[PDB]
């Protein structure tokens, strides 16, 4: 029901190995739809989802011009931040940016986001009010003054409340067959003896979309949080996701354990047990 759009920018310096690389990727929920890479043989915005291919040359040129300007701006930003932290010209550094809009189940703007990081640490973020900034340190306070002078927050608020929402709604309609289709997980419980008196029960969830899922193990109706080995949700490579949760159970006690699966694609939540 709820949908979001996000752009992810990564700008990485590499002293002695040319100018900094700038990569931008665009997503609607868990689906990537665009990419731009300053390192590509011919840098241009490229489609990464079938429903975006219908956009005209004016869309592709508009995207390419923005990302080519960003490639140059981020090279300047990397030089500036190196200076703000009194860093030597020898090390490689990274600026990351993630921004976008969230829509509620009715399609209205829930909230906007705009966050930047330097070497994986929060640097500057637009507050939820879309009017003020949160600067992490004295270096980020310099960026804050520059961004206030250029009226960045005002420009972002207009984009986040306007163009961001309008274009997300357009993508949701054009890609409705995939973006607005929740694929339920295909589930099963495997059993693997580990010794004479204990075995692993593994609860699988495969082929689901979106990535959001809850897989839990319960022993006599109570959650096994500390005892559950839970892998990170992983992409199958065909748009869908995978996940598993495992518990080491005393031999004979298997029926006291239940796996609970919650996902948007399911008609009702699942209750699974090992079926010998």
């Amino acid at each position: 029901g709820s949908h979001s759009m996000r752009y992810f920018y990564t700008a990485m310096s590499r002293p002695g190995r040319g100018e900094p690389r700038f990569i931008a990727v665009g997503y609607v929920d868990d689906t990537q739809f665009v990419r731009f890479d300053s390192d590509a043989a011919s840098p241009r915005t490229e489609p990464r989802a079938p429903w975006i291919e219908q956009e005209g040359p004016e869309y592709w040129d508009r995207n390419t011009q923005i990302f080519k300007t960003n490639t140059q701006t981020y090279r300047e930003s990397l030089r500036n931040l190196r200076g703000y932290y009194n860093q030597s010209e020898a090390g490689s550094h990274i600026i990351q940016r993630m921004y976008g809009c969230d829509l509620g189940p009715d399609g209205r703007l829930l909230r906007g986001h705009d966050q930047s990081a330097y070497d994986g640490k929060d640097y500057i973020a637009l507050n939820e009010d879309l009017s003020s900034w949160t600067a992490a340190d004295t270096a980020a306070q310099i960026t804050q003054r520059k961004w206030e002078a250029a009226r960045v927050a005002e420009q972002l608020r207009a984009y986040l409340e306007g163009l961001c929402v309008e274009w997300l709604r357009r993508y949701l309609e054009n890609g409705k067959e995939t973006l607005q289709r929740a694929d339920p997980p295909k589930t099963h419980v495997t059993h693997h003896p580990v010794s004479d008196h204990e075995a692993t029960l593994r609860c699988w969830a495969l082929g689901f979309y979106p990535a959001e899922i809850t897989l839990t193990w319960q022993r006599d109706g109570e959650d096994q949080t500390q005892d559950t080995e839970l892998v990170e949700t992983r992409p199958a490579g065909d748009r869908t996701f995978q996940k598993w949760a495992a518990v080491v159970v005393p031999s004979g006690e298997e029926q006291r354990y239940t796996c609970h699966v919650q996902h948007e694609g399911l008609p009702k939540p699942l209750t699974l047990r090992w079926e010998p």
Binding site: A24, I66, A150, Q155, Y159, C164
Partner: peptide, 9 residues
């Protein structure tokens, strides 16, 4: 569609 303004940090 991405944000159209770029500002040096």
């Amino acid at each position: 569609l991405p944000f159209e303004k770029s500002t040096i940090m």
